[PDB]
Short mmCIF file of C-alpha atoms and ligand atoms in Angstrom, two decimals:
data_model
loop_
_atom_site.label_atom_id
_atom_site.label_comp_id
_atom_site.label_asym_id
_atom_site.label_seq_id
_atom_site.Cartn_x
_atom_site.Cartn_y
_atom_site.Cartn_z
CA UNK S 1 -0.04 -0.34 -0.10
CA UNK S 2 3.13 1.75 0.09
CA UNK S 3 1.62 4.24 3.00
CA UNK S 4 3.05 5.76 6.49
CA UNK S 5 1.37 3.85 9.34
CA UNK S 6 -2.13 5.40 10.83
CA UNK S 7 -2.53 6.92 13.68
CA UNK S 8 -4.52 9.61 15.32
CA UNK S 9 -4.76 12.93 13.82
CA UNK S 10 -2.44 15.72 14.62
CA UNK S 11 -2.92 19.15 14.93
CA UNK S 12 -0.13 21.97 13.93
CA UNK S 13 3.00 21.79 15.79
CA UNK S 14 1.21 20.48 19.40
CA UNK S 15 0.72 16.80 16.97
CA UNK S 16 -1.39 14.33 18.93
CA UNK S 17 -0.65 16.59 22.55
CA UNK S 18 -4.21 16.33 23.60
CA UNK S 19 -4.54 12.21 22.84
CA UNK S 20 -1.62 11.55 24.72
CA UNK S 21 -0.66 11.96 29.08
CA UNK S 22 3.03 13.17 29.53
CA UNK S 23 2.54 11.05 32.92
CA UNK S 24 1.92 8.27 31.75
CA UNK S 25 3.22 7.53 27.99
CA UNK S 26 3.41 4.20 27.63
CA UNK S 27 -0.59 3.85 28.67
CA UNK S 28 -1.06 6.60 26.60
CA UNK S 29 0.21 4.66 23.44
CA UNK S 30 -0.98 1.14 24.11
CA UNK S 31 -4.35 3.01 24.47
CA UNK S 32 -3.93 4.17 20.68
CA UNK S 33 -2.63 0.43 19.97
CA UNK S 34 -5.38 -0.57 20.75
CA UNK S 35 -7.33 0.93 18.06
CA UNK S 36 -4.54 1.01 15.01
CA UNK S 37 -2.54 -1.68 15.97
CA UNK S 38 0.63 -2.81 17.49
CA UNK S 39 2.35 -0.41 14.30
CA UNK S 40 0.89 3.22 13.93
CA UNK S 41 2.30 6.73 14.01
CA UNK S 42 2.32 9.26 17.00
CA UNK S 43 3.58 12.83 16.88
CA UNK S 44 5.53 14.12 19.97
CA UNK S 45 4.51 17.86 19.17
CA UNK S 46 6.04 17.90 15.34
CA UNK S 47 8.08 14.68 16.26
CA UNK S 48 6.55 11.89 13.52
CA UNK S 49 7.37 8.64 15.42
CA UNK S 50 6.30 4.85 14.45
CA UNK S 51 5.59 3.17 17.23
CA UNK S 52 6.20 -1.21 17.45
CA UNK S 53 4.33 -2.65 20.06
CA UNK S 54 4.67 -6.31 21.24
CA UNK S 55 7.61 -8.94 19.91
CA UNK S 56 6.59 -9.26 16.76
CA UNK S 57 7.09 -5.80 15.61
CA UNK S 58 9.94 -5.24 17.36
CA UNK S 59 11.83 -8.42 16.89
CA UNK S 60 10.94 -7.83 12.85
CA UNK S 61 12.27 -4.42 12.06
CA UNK S 62 15.38 -3.30 14.58
CA UNK S 63 15.94 -7.99 13.74
CA UNK S 64 14.82 -8.89 10.78
CA UNK S 65 15.28 -5.26 9.15
CA UNK S 66 18.10 -4.65 11.35
CA UNK S 67 20.27 -2.25 9.12
CA UNK S 68 16.81 -0.50 7.71
CA UNK S 69 16.72 0.35 11.48
CA UNK S 70 20.27 1.02 12.82
CA UNK S 71 19.54 5.02 12.68
CA UNK S 72 19.46 6.98 16.36
CA UNK S 73 16.58 8.92 17.34
CA UNK S 74 16.65 11.66 19.80
CA UNK S 75 16.54 11.83 23.76
CA UNK S 76 15.90 15.55 23.94
CA UNK S 77 17.04 16.47 27.69
CA UNK S 78 19.91 13.83 26.61
CA UNK S 79 21.01 15.92 23.36
CA UNK S 80 20.77 19.18 25.45
CA UNK S 81 23.76 18.31 27.02
CA UNK S 82 25.35 15.60 23.78
CA UNK S 83 23.92 17.50 20.28
CA UNK S 84 25.15 14.66 18.56
CA UNK S 85 28.31 13.67 20.00
CA UNK S 86 29.54 10.02 22.17
CA UNK S 87 29.03 6.48 20.82
CA UNK S 88 25.33 6.36 22.31
CA UNK S 89 23.43 9.40 20.09
CA UNK S 90 25.53 9.70 16.95
CA UNK S 91 24.56 8.62 14.27
CA UNK S 92 26.43 7.33 10.33
CA UNK S 93 30.13 6.60 10.41
CA UNK S 94 30.26 8.66 13.52
CA UNK S 95 28.80 5.79 15.36
CA UNK S 96 29.90 3.53 13.72
CA UNK S 97 33.27 4.70 14.30
CA UNK S 98 32.69 5.26 18.31
CA UNK S 99 30.94 2.17 19.10
CA UNK S 100 33.87 -0.34 17.32
CA UNK S 101 36.56 1.94 19.18
CA UNK S 102 34.37 1.55 22.70
CA UNK S 103 33.55 -1.98 22.49
CA UNK S 104 37.58 -3.12 22.23
CA UNK S 105 38.18 -0.71 24.76
CA UNK S 106 36.24 -2.08 26.73
CA UNK S 107 37.35 -6.00 26.03
CA UNK S 108 40.90 -4.65 26.52
CA UNK S 109 39.99 -3.71 30.17
CA UNK S 110 38.39 -6.48 31.55
CA UNK S 111 34.75 -6.50 30.23
CA UNK S 112 34.08 -10.09 29.22
CA UNK S 113 37.45 -11.52 31.31
CA UNK S 114 38.70 -12.44 34.60
CA UNK S 115 39.95 -9.19 35.39
CA UNK S 116 36.78 -7.08 35.01
CA UNK S 117 35.07 -10.18 37.29
CA UNK S 118 37.79 -9.47 39.93
CA UNK S 119 37.17 -5.86 39.66
CA UNK S 120 33.25 -6.87 39.89
CA UNK S 121 33.84 -8.94 43.14
CA UNK S 122 36.45 -6.68 45.24
CA UNK S 123 33.10 -4.02 44.31
CA UNK S 124 30.77 -6.64 45.76
CA UNK S 125 32.78 -7.45 49.04
CA UNK S 126 32.68 -2.92 49.69
CA UNK S 127 28.97 -3.27 49.56
CA UNK S 128 29.15 -6.10 51.73
CA UNK S 129 31.47 -3.99 54.18
CA UNK S 130 29.20 -1.62 54.06
CA UNK S 131 25.94 -3.51 54.79
CA UNK S 132 26.71 -4.53 57.62
CA UNK S 133 28.36 -1.07 57.93
CA UNK S 134 24.77 -0.37 58.80
CA UNK S 135 24.04 -2.46 61.73
CA UNK S 136 21.25 -4.46 60.51
CA UNK S 137 19.12 -0.38 60.65
CA UNK S 138 16.36 0.59 58.90
CA UNK S 139 18.26 2.10 55.42
CA UNK S 140 17.53 4.37 52.58
CA UNK S 141 19.19 1.85 50.27
CA UNK S 142 19.28 3.69 47.03
CA UNK S 143 23.13 5.44 47.12
CA UNK S 144 23.92 2.21 48.98
CA UNK S 145 23.59 0.39 45.37
CA UNK S 146 24.41 2.92 42.70
CA UNK S 147 27.99 3.64 44.62
CA UNK S 148 29.26 0.43 43.94
CA UNK S 149 27.64 -0.36 40.81
CA UNK S 150 29.56 3.11 39.57
CA UNK S 151 32.66 1.93 40.76
CA UNK S 152 32.50 -0.55 38.12
CA UNK S 153 32.19 0.97 34.95
CA UNK S 154 34.68 4.35 36.88
CA UNK S 155 37.39 1.95 37.03
CA UNK S 156 37.32 1.59 33.06
CA UNK S 157 37.13 4.91 32.37
CA UNK S 158 38.95 7.17 34.99
CA UNK S 159 41.36 4.41 35.88
CA UNK S 160 40.30 3.88 39.46
CA UNK S 161 37.13 3.02 42.18
CA UNK S 162 35.68 6.56 43.91
CA UNK S 163 35.73 6.25 47.71
CA UNK S 164 32.16 5.60 49.01
CA UNK S 165 32.82 8.31 51.30
CA UNK S 166 33.89 11.16 48.47
CA UNK S 167 31.23 13.48 48.70
CA UNK S 168 31.79 14.44 45.62
CA UNK S 169 30.84 11.22 44.28
CA UNK S 170 27.97 11.41 45.95
CA UNK S 171 27.42 14.26 44.30
CA UNK S 172 27.57 12.81 40.68
CA UNK S 173 25.59 10.14 41.82
CA UNK S 174 22.65 12.59 42.53
CA UNK S 175 22.25 14.25 38.99
CA UNK S 176 22.39 10.44 37.28
CA UNK S 177 19.43 9.98 39.35
CA UNK S 178 17.69 13.04 39.28
CA UNK S 179 17.95 13.51 35.94
CA UNK S 180 16.62 9.86 35.24
CA UNK S 181 13.68 10.38 37.54
CA UNK S 182 13.50 13.51 35.54
CA UNK S 183 13.19 11.85 31.96
CA UNK S 184 10.14 10.03 33.24
CA UNK S 185 8.35 12.23 35.18
CA UNK S 186 5.27 14.09 32.74
CA UNK S 187 7.40 17.00 32.38
CA UNK S 188 10.37 15.44 31.01
CA UNK S 189 8.04 13.74 28.50
CA UNK S 190 6.61 17.11 27.92
CA UNK S 191 9.80 18.25 26.84
CA UNK S 192 10.36 16.02 24.75
CA UNK S 193 7.65 17.05 22.84
CA UNK S 194 8.36 20.53 22.87
CA UNK S 195 11.56 20.73 23.71
CA UNK S 196 12.19 23.93 20.71
CA UNK S 197 10.34 26.14 23.32
CA UNK S 198 11.65 24.42 26.53
CA UNK S 199 14.76 24.16 26.82
CA UNK S 200 14.70 28.24 26.89
CA UNK S 201 11.91 28.73 29.10
CA UNK S 202 12.77 28.39 33.51
CA UNK S 203 11.10 25.11 35.10
CA UNK S 204 12.88 21.71 36.01
CA UNK S 205 13.94 20.99 32.34
CA UNK S 206 16.71 23.45 33.57
CA UNK S 207 17.63 22.14 37.02
CA UNK S 208 18.16 18.84 34.46
CA UNK S 209 20.29 20.37 32.46
CA UNK S 210 22.59 21.93 35.49
CA UNK S 211 22.76 18.13 36.33
CA UNK S 212 24.10 17.29 32.47
CA UNK S 213 26.50 20.65 32.37
CA UNK S 214 27.27 19.03 36.03
CA UNK S 215 29.07 16.11 34.63
CA UNK S 216 30.32 17.28 32.00
CA UNK S 217 32.21 19.49 33.70
CA UNK S 218 33.36 16.59 35.50
CA UNK S 219 34.08 14.33 33.01
CA UNK S 220 36.64 17.26 31.31
CA UNK S 221 38.01 17.63 34.47
CA UNK S 222 39.35 14.36 34.14
CA UNK S 223 39.87 14.14 30.25
CA UNK S 224 42.61 17.17 31.14
CA UNK S 225 44.44 15.65 34.13
CA UNK S 226 44.90 12.31 32.16
CA UNK S 227 46.46 14.73 29.57
CA UNK S 228 48.72 15.66 31.22
CA UNK S 229 49.87 12.48 33.01
CA UNK S 230 49.71 10.63 29.96
CA UNK S 231 52.47 7.91 28.99
CA UNK S 232 51.47 7.04 24.98
CA UNK S 233 52.81 3.05 25.65
CA UNK S 234 50.13 2.55 28.66
CA UNK S 235 46.58 3.23 28.66
CA UNK S 236 45.69 4.03 32.42
CA UNK S 237 41.84 3.46 31.07
CA UNK S 238 39.60 4.50 28.87
CA UNK S 239 39.83 8.22 28.32
CA UNK S 240 44.11 7.16 27.95
CA UNK S 241 43.01 5.15 25.45
CA UNK S 242 40.92 7.45 23.09
CA UNK S 243 43.40 9.85 23.96
CA UNK S 244 46.19 7.88 22.21
CA UNK S 245 43.69 7.59 19.42
CA UNK S 246 43.10 11.50 19.29
CA UNK S 247 46.93 11.99 19.17
CA UNK S 248 46.49 8.87 16.25
CA UNK S 249 44.36 10.52 14.21
CA UNK S 250 45.72 14.63 14.42
CA UNK S 251 47.08 14.40 10.59
CA UNK S 252 43.64 13.27 9.60
CA UNK S 253 40.96 16.36 9.01
CA UNK S 254 38.15 14.12 8.98
CA UNK S 255 38.46 11.66 11.95
CA UNK S 256 35.84 11.19 14.51
CA UNK S 257 38.10 10.80 17.22
CA UNK S 258 38.24 14.10 18.87
CA UNK S 259 37.49 15.80 22.21
CA UNK S 260 34.23 16.42 22.04
CA UNK S 261 33.54 12.46 21.27
CA UNK S 262 36.21 11.53 23.77
CA UNK S 263 34.11 13.74 26.35
CA UNK S 264 30.80 12.70 25.72
CA UNK S 265 31.65 9.01 25.04
CA UNK S 266 32.67 8.56 28.57
CA UNK S 267 30.18 10.76 29.99
CA UNK S 268 27.42 8.25 28.22
CA UNK S 269 29.28 5.31 29.66
CA UNK S 270 29.59 7.17 32.84
CA UNK S 271 25.47 7.34 33.43
CA UNK S 272 24.86 4.42 30.61
CA UNK S 273 26.73 2.07 33.02
CA UNK S 274 25.51 3.20 36.46
CA UNK S 275 22.14 4.54 36.65
CA UNK S 276 20.47 1.81 35.08
CA UNK S 277 22.29 -1.20 36.58
CA UNK S 278 21.47 0.45 40.13
CA UNK S 279 17.06 0.72 39.60
CA UNK S 280 17.74 -2.41 38.44
CA UNK S 281 18.90 -3.76 42.08
CA UNK S 282 16.79 -1.04 43.78
CA UNK S 283 13.32 -2.93 42.59
CA UNK S 284 14.94 -6.07 43.05
CA UNK S 285 15.82 -5.39 46.59
CA UNK S 286 12.25 -4.12 46.99
CA UNK S 287 10.54 -7.09 44.35
CA UNK S 288 11.98 -9.95 46.95
CA UNK S 289 10.70 -8.73 50.70
CA UNK S 290 7.37 -7.82 48.52
CA UNK S 291 7.78 -11.76 47.77
CA UNK S 292 9.16 -14.06 50.67
CA UNK S 293 8.75 -17.25 48.97
CA UNK S 294 11.35 -16.42 46.59
CA UNK S 295 13.83 -14.45 48.86
CA UNK S 296 13.75 -17.91 50.29
CA UNK S 297 14.77 -20.42 47.21
CA UNK S 298 17.26 -17.95 46.46
CA UNK S 299 18.91 -19.05 49.51
CA UNK S 300 18.25 -22.56 49.22
CA UNK S 301 20.37 -22.62 46.31
CA UNK S 302 22.73 -19.83 47.17
CA UNK S 303 23.46 -22.54 50.54
CA UNK S 304 23.97 -25.30 48.26
CA UNK S 305 25.43 -24.57 45.28
CA UNK S 306 28.07 -22.01 47.08
CA UNK S 307 27.63 -21.98 51.17
CA UNK S 308 28.78 -19.46 53.91
CA UNK S 309 32.24 -18.73 52.94
CA UNK S 310 33.59 -18.45 49.19
CA UNK S 311 32.59 -15.30 47.20
CA UNK S 312 30.09 -15.93 44.00
CA UNK S 313 31.48 -16.51 40.58
CA UNK S 314 29.67 -15.85 38.05
CA UNK S 315 30.08 -18.93 36.60
CA UNK S 316 28.21 -19.90 39.68
CA UNK S 317 25.00 -19.08 37.35
CA UNK S 318 25.30 -22.30 35.40
CA UNK S 319 24.60 -24.21 38.55
CA UNK S 320 21.91 -21.90 39.72
CA UNK S 321 19.22 -21.87 37.08
CA UNK S 322 16.39 -20.08 39.99
CA UNK S 323 18.63 -17.16 40.85
CA UNK S 324 18.88 -17.14 36.78
CA UNK S 325 14.70 -16.74 36.05
CA UNK S 326 14.45 -14.52 39.36
CA UNK S 327 16.74 -12.07 38.16
CA UNK S 328 14.77 -12.14 34.64
CA UNK S 329 12.32 -11.95 35.98
CA UNK S 330 13.13 -8.88 37.97
CA UNK S 331 14.08 -7.39 35.03
CA UNK S 332 11.12 -7.99 33.24
CA UNK S 333 8.97 -6.42 35.57
CA UNK S 334 11.66 -3.77 36.24
CA UNK S 335 11.07 -2.92 32.66
CA UNK S 336 13.81 -0.17 33.41
CA UNK S 337 14.19 1.94 29.98
CA UNK S 338 10.62 1.15 29.25
CA UNK S 339 10.34 2.56 25.60
CA UNK S 340 14.28 1.71 24.77
CA UNK S 341 16.28 4.06 22.94
CA UNK S 342 14.39 5.65 20.11
CA UNK S 343 16.04 4.88 16.74
CA UNK S 344 15.45 5.94 13.03
CA UNK S 345 15.11 4.33 9.32
CA UNK S 346 18.63 4.65 7.45
CA UNK S 347 17.13 5.03 4.57
CA UNK S 348 12.95 4.74 2.67
CA UNK S 349 11.62 1.57 4.44
CA UNK S 350 8.98 -0.96 3.27
CA UNK S 351 7.77 -2.60 7.17
CA UNK S 352 4.49 -4.98 6.62
CA UNK S 353 3.32 -2.78 3.80
CA UNK S 354 4.47 0.71 5.48
CA UNK S 355 6.12 2.84 3.74
CA UNK S 356 8.98 4.81 6.65
CA UNK S 357 10.35 7.31 5.01
CA UNK S 358 14.72 8.01 5.48
CA UNK S 359 14.82 9.51 9.01
CA UNK S 360 11.74 8.83 10.33
CA UNK S 361 11.96 7.97 13.89
CA UNK S 362 10.97 4.43 15.71
CA UNK S 363 10.08 4.01 19.16
CA UNK S 364 10.75 0.33 19.87
CA UNK S 365 8.07 -0.26 23.22
CA UNK S 366 9.98 -2.72 25.03
CA UNK S 367 7.73 -2.65 27.77
CA UNK S 368 5.40 -4.14 25.29
CA UNK S 369 7.60 -6.89 24.83
CA UNK S 370 8.33 -8.02 28.10
CA UNK S 371 4.54 -8.44 28.57
CA UNK S 372 3.19 -9.95 25.07
CA UNK S 373 0.34 -12.02 26.83
CA UNK S 374 1.40 -14.18 24.37
CA UNK S 375 5.01 -14.87 25.62
CA UNK S 376 4.46 -14.68 29.79
CA UNK S 377 1.12 -16.00 30.84
CA UNK S 378 0.87 -13.68 34.32
CA UNK S 379 2.96 -10.78 32.10
CA UNK S 380 1.75 -8.28 35.52
CA UNK S 381 3.03 -10.53 38.13
CA UNK S 382 6.32 -11.13 39.81
CA UNK S 383 6.52 -14.37 38.45
CA UNK S 384 10.27 -16.12 38.45
CA UNK S 385 8.33 -19.56 36.70
CA UNK S 386 7.50 -16.77 33.44
CA UNK S 387 11.93 -18.18 33.42
CA UNK S 388 11.59 -21.58 34.43
CA UNK S 389 10.02 -24.83 33.17
CA UNK S 390 8.09 -27.63 34.39
CA UNK S 391 11.66 -29.16 36.03
CA UNK S 392 12.32 -26.30 37.05
CA UNK S 393 15.22 -25.22 34.67
CA UNK S 394 16.06 -22.12 33.52
CA UNK S 395 14.03 -21.33 30.01
CA UNK S 396 14.92 -18.24 28.10
CA UNK S 397 12.54 -16.00 25.77
CA UNK S 398 12.45 -13.95 22.53
CA UNK S 399 10.53 -11.18 24.60
CA UNK S 400 13.15 -11.09 26.89
CA UNK S 401 15.36 -7.71 25.31
CA UNK S 402 15.55 -5.76 28.30
CA UNK S 403 19.04 -4.62 26.81
CA UNK S 404 16.55 -4.28 23.36
CA UNK S 405 17.88 -6.12 20.44
CA UNK S 406 19.34 -5.28 16.60
CA UNK S 407 22.80 -3.16 15.90
CA UNK S 408 22.37 -0.58 17.86
CA UNK S 409 21.29 -2.74 20.92
CA UNK S 410 23.22 -2.09 24.43
CA UNK S 411 26.84 -3.47 23.93
CA UNK S 412 26.97 -2.91 28.00
CA UNK S 413 25.27 -6.08 28.29
CA UNK S 414 27.30 -8.42 28.77
CA UNK S 415 29.17 -5.58 32.10
CA UNK S 416 25.06 -5.73 33.41
CA UNK S 417 24.47 -9.41 33.26
CA UNK S 418 27.81 -10.34 35.06
CA UNK S 419 27.30 -7.21 37.45
CA UNK S 420 24.23 -8.16 38.47
CA UNK S 421 24.30 -11.67 38.61
CA UNK S 422 27.85 -11.19 41.58
CA UNK S 423 25.62 -8.28 43.23
CA UNK S 424 22.13 -9.71 43.98
CA UNK S 425 23.62 -13.32 44.90
CA UNK S 426 26.37 -11.71 46.76
CA UNK S 427 23.96 -9.66 49.29
CA UNK S 428 21.60 -12.60 49.08
CA UNK S 429 24.10 -14.73 50.22
CA UNK S 430 25.60 -12.98 53.13
CA UNK S 431 21.57 -11.22 53.95
CA UNK S 432 17.60 -11.55 54.16
CA UNK S 433 15.54 -8.73 53.81
CA UNK S 434 13.67 -6.88 56.59
CA UNK S 435 11.54 -4.42 54.56
CA UNK S 436 9.65 -1.91 56.81
CA UNK S 437 5.83 -2.91 56.24
CA UNK S 438 3.97 -5.83 55.58
CA UNK S 439 4.96 -7.79 52.64
CA UNK S 440 0.99 -7.33 51.15
CA UNK S 441 1.02 -3.69 51.80
CA UNK S 442 3.79 -3.18 49.46
CA UNK S 443 3.67 -1.15 46.20
CA UNK S 444 5.65 -2.38 43.72
CA UNK S 445 4.12 -0.64 41.28
CA UNK S 446 6.16 2.45 39.66
CA UNK S 447 6.76 6.23 40.63
CA UNK S 448 6.96 7.42 37.16
CA UNK S 449 7.17 5.88 34.20
CA UNK S 450 9.01 7.67 31.17
CA UNK S 451 12.34 7.40 29.47
CA UNK S 452 13.18 5.19 32.74
CA UNK S 453 10.79 3.29 35.25
CA UNK S 454 11.11 4.38 38.71
CA UNK S 455 10.11 1.81 41.50
CA UNK S 456 8.87 4.18 44.69
CA UNK S 457 11.10 5.02 47.29
CA UNK S 458 11.23 2.88 50.58
CA UNK S 459 13.66 1.49 53.12
CA UNK S 460 14.61 -1.50 54.40
CA UNK S 461 17.51 -3.18 56.62
CA UNK S 462 19.75 -5.87 55.43
CA UNK S 463 19.98 -8.56 58.51
CA UNK S 464 22.87 -10.75 58.42
CA UNK S 465 22.46 -14.61 58.19
C1 HEM T 501 20.98 -3.78 33.34
C2 HEM T 501 21.48 -2.31 33.11
C3 HEM T 501 20.78 -1.25 31.28
C4 HEM T 501 20.09 -1.63 30.83
C5 HEM T 501 18.47 -2.76 31.42
C6 HEM T 501 20.60 -1.07 29.63
C7 HEM T 501 19.44 -0.54 28.06
C8 HEM T 501 19.93 -0.61 27.00
C9 HEM T 501 19.13 -0.16 26.02
C10 HEM T 501 17.59 -0.03 26.33
C11 HEM T 501 20.06 0.68 25.47
C12 HEM T 501 19.02 1.22 23.68
C13 HEM T 501 19.65 -0.26 22.43
C14 HEM T 501 19.27 0.22 21.34
O1 HEM T 501 19.04 1.41 20.46
O2 HEM T 501 17.92 -0.88 20.60
C15 HEM T 501 21.05 0.53 25.75
C16 HEM T 501 21.93 1.92 24.88
C17 HEM T 501 23.60 1.52 25.34
N1 HEM T 501 24.00 0.85 26.73
FE1 HEM T 501 23.00 -0.11 28.10
N2 HEM T 501 21.64 -0.89 29.35
C18 HEM T 501 22.05 -1.60 30.68
C19 HEM T 501 23.12 -1.70 31.05
C20 HEM T 501 24.82 -0.75 30.24
C21 HEM T 501 26.47 -0.80 30.68
C22 HEM T 501 26.30 -1.33 32.07
C23 HEM T 501 26.55 0.16 29.83
C24 HEM T 501 28.15 0.91 29.89
C25 HEM T 501 29.00 -0.44 29.67
C26 HEM T 501 26.17 0.51 28.86
C27 HEM T 501 26.23 0.79 27.74
C28 HEM T 501 25.04 1.13 26.46
C29 HEM T 501 25.73 1.87 25.77
C30 HEM T 501 26.56 2.49 25.40
C31 HEM T 501 24.68 2.12 24.62
C32 HEM T 501 24.23 2.91 23.52
C33 HEM T 501 24.75 1.99 22.46
C34 HEM T 501 24.45 2.67 20.64
O3 HEM T 501 24.23 3.94 20.65
O4 HEM T 501 24.86 1.79 19.45
N3 HEM T 501 24.22 -0.30 29.04
N4 HEM T 501 20.62 0.29 26.98
#
């Protein structure tokens, strides 16, 4: 039929604003889906976007027509500081160049090997100390977790970990949490529509830019330091590596390796490798307290497979199917990045008898995939059985796509999975979770759902086993 997907009729400038709700974009987009189908067109202000709902539609596009959908779309709040630079929000040659360099530079510093595992196990041991540091008192786990997580990716890029007491470190973590929380509030989602005007007006968005400007300034600082303490044959970290390449590409006018890409790519890995994992852990513990029966089974498997003395190791997962189903169930229910990171068609495309012209933005509704009623029997509930078969063995699912799928998929998935398995397991081995309220009253529903999925604020206590 050679034509763009159908959808609600837009008014000038505001688009389909009146047919949406900034506080609940996902729900609003799904409602519209009920009427136009799993694949439709919506206008976020002047942003013409094609929405993909359900596993089938998403896998077809991002995987079956991968190259066609390999373009990177936009996220206005982040593009405020990134402006198309860095590996995450760049396109074409710039993205091809930075992405390839990032993956390799990550493998050279241990990602996917013994070095990174040992670094994660060491940081895990530091979390344990910190948790015992509480003496079982009821606390907000938020920053206990992000400090631990952030130090993993920090080791890669900045060269070493941060001190848990380092106050500038706390400051940087508050900025990351503040930014992810803002992009999920209705104002943050309204800004996705009217950034052209909102970026110049007073309001919460300004505070969000300050936090981004604060993380950039910090990155710029560290880079300068590395720039004047650099050993061109011995790179200390990601930043030194990039610098090496930069010096090596000075006589090339068209290189993609210059200061701005270094700063942004770094700020992106720092933020990306922190908040997403931190949020996942934070939500997961909430879910475990809400479900004692599960915490109990996790303990049975941990005690049996690992014991109480040695540290859990990554390979231990092959022997812990239940613990594996849990982490998946946590990522599925969590739905951390509900609408993934926008994609855009790299060139005119024919999709399911629809025409998508070059440049069209795409919204892969990963949340609609993690809950596709056709791959999970009770999508709305937290049930590890979703990833286990009859004999209690780990069962994979094609609908499991928290890291998205396709050519611009999360290349931090490996590190994230190793972190999630080592952190959850090691904490569960050493503690039992005491929530501050009767399980039945615990609210596991989200506080904010926008660019991210944010669990509700809560306190708990870690009692020694
Ligand atoms: C449990 C944690 C994490 C989740 C749920 C997650 C999720 C995502 C998602 C949904 C995307 C977009 C994929 C697409 O375009 O189709 C993405 C992008 C990416 N992630 Fe993650 N991520 C996590 C952890 C990490 C970590 C630990 C790192 C860093 C080492 C990281 C690095 C990135 C980067 C650099 C991109 C952009 C890739 C590109 O543009 O080609 N992520 N992530």
